[PDB]
Design an enzyme around this catalytic site. Structure first.
Site, PDB file in Angstrom:
ATOM      1  N   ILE A  16      48.315  24.450  30.905  1.00 42.51           N
ATOM      2  CA  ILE A  16      46.948  24.772  31.324  1.00 42.51           C
ATOM      3  C   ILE A  16      45.924  23.748  30.807  1.00 42.51           C
ATOM      4  O   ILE A  16      44.942  23.469  31.488  1.00 42.51           O
ATOM      5  CB  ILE A  16      46.589  26.241  30.912  1.00 42.51           C
ATOM      6  CG1 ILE A  16      46.598  27.145  32.138  1.00 42.51           C
ATOM      7  CG2 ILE A  16      45.231  26.349  30.234  1.00 42.51           C
ATOM      8  CD1 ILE A  16      47.918  27.241  32.813  1.00 42.51           C
ATOM      9  N   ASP A 129      32.043  26.482  15.162  1.00 43.75           N
ATOM     10  CA  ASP A 129      32.000  25.799  16.454  1.00 43.75           C
ATOM     11  C   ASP A 129      31.707  26.792  17.595  1.00 43.75           C
ATOM     12  O   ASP A 129      32.324  26.737  18.666  1.00 43.75           O
ATOM     13  CB  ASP A 129      33.327  25.044  16.689  1.00 43.75           C
ATOM     14  CG  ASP A 129      33.211  23.919  17.727  1.00 43.75           C
ATOM     15  OD1 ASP A 129      32.095  23.641  18.221  1.00 43.75           O
ATOM     16  OD2 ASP A 129      34.256  23.301  18.048  1.00 43.75           O
TER      17      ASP A 129
END
Ligand SMILES: CCCS(=O)(=O)Nc1ccc(F)c(-n2cc(-c3cncnc3)c3nc(N(C)C4CCN(CC)CC4)ccc32)c1F
Ligand SMILES: OC[C@H]1O[C@H](O)[C@H](O)[C@@H](O)[C@@H]1O
Length: 261
Positions: A16, A129
């Site tokens: 993916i 993050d």
């Protein structure tokens, strides 16, 4: 305790995504799963520890708005297994797909992200993050906070727009307060439909001026139907001095209150 999946149980399917640090596959293990394998066949000694210490962090998270950790593989490769989510990230919806959510939905996304962050911080986990790329909309409805980057090993570049001034400066850095700033930039995204600093041409310019205090997001770009509570909360979350920014319990409680009306 037995979150290690034995060799052979997972059927690794389609790739993916791919980067320097890792590769992600769709796979079969009692249904659909995502499998992030680390691009390092021969594991350097006590990089396994970095893998183990992350596994020990992910193991502590049980919440609907956090991507569900399901297990890990040591053999054949070092791998982390999560639930498979159908859909795409907030970043893709807002900035690539031109999705035009209603305000009720926008506040609901801000609410669920707050819930997840509040949960993380209540377990002393700092995300480091938080950004719209790392907020997956599962079924295009449920926020699933994760860390979808495959470029670098997690610090513990393409995230600068969400980085707090002190985090850009690197004078000593990452804290609950810096996570809260990133969430501020997510509210900006939700309420304006745009990334901050759209007019600024250069990243090094953003790094310099946000680091030296001379640049901040244009709050006047918020949609005309943006609630007053949210524009105020956004501004509190974006404050330059770290300690002036609110904690997630009050952020969540404020957003839950504005959703009810
Ligand atoms: C329990 C939290 C662990 S975490 O911090 O989130 N880290 C982590 C561990 C294991 C993983 F498999 C994952 N992880 C899971 C998924 C995922 C899930 N469902 C459904 N599609 C993709 C995932 N996509 C990544 N991308 C970069 C893909 C994002 C979607 N796009 C569409 C064009 C393709 C690339 C990178 C890591 C990913 C992870 F992100
Ligand atoms: O390693 C810390 C991790 O904590 C949580 O599981 C977050 O969902 C994930 O994004 C972060 O990477």
């Amino acid at each position: 305790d037995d979150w290690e999946i034995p060799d052979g149980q997972i059927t690794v399917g389609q790739r993916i995504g791919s980067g320097s640090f890792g590769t992600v596959y769709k796979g079969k293990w009692h249904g659909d799963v995502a499998v992030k394998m680390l691009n390092v066949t021969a594991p350097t000694p006590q990089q396994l520890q970095a893998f183990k210490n992350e596994v020990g962090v992910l193991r502590k998270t049980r919440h609907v708005n956090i991507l569900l950790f399901m297990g890990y593989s040591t053999k054949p490769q070092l791998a982390i297994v999560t639930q498979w989510c159908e859909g795409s990230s907030l970043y893709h919806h807002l900035h690539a797909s031109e999705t035009k959510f209603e305000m009720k939905k926008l506040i609901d996304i801000a609410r669920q992200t707050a819930r997840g962050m509040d949960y993380l911080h209540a377990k002393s986990i700092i995300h480091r993050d938080l950004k719209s790329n790392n907020i997956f909309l599962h079924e295009d409805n449920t926020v699933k906070i994760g860390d979808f980057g495959l470029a670098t090993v997690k610090s513990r570049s393409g995230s600068i727009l969400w980085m707090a001034p002190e985090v850009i400066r690197m004078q000593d850095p990452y804290s609950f307060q810096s996570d809260v700033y990133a969430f501020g930039i997510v509210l900006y995204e939700l309420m304006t439909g745009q990334l901050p600093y759209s007019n600024i041409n250069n990243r090094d310019q953003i790094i310099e001026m946000v680091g030296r205090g001379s640049l901040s997001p244009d709050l006047s770009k918020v949609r005309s139907n943006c609630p007053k509570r949210m524009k105020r909360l956004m501004a509190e979350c974006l404050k330059k001095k770290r300690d002036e920014r609110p904690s997630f319990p009050r952020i969540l409680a404020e957003i839950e209150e504005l959703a009810r009306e």
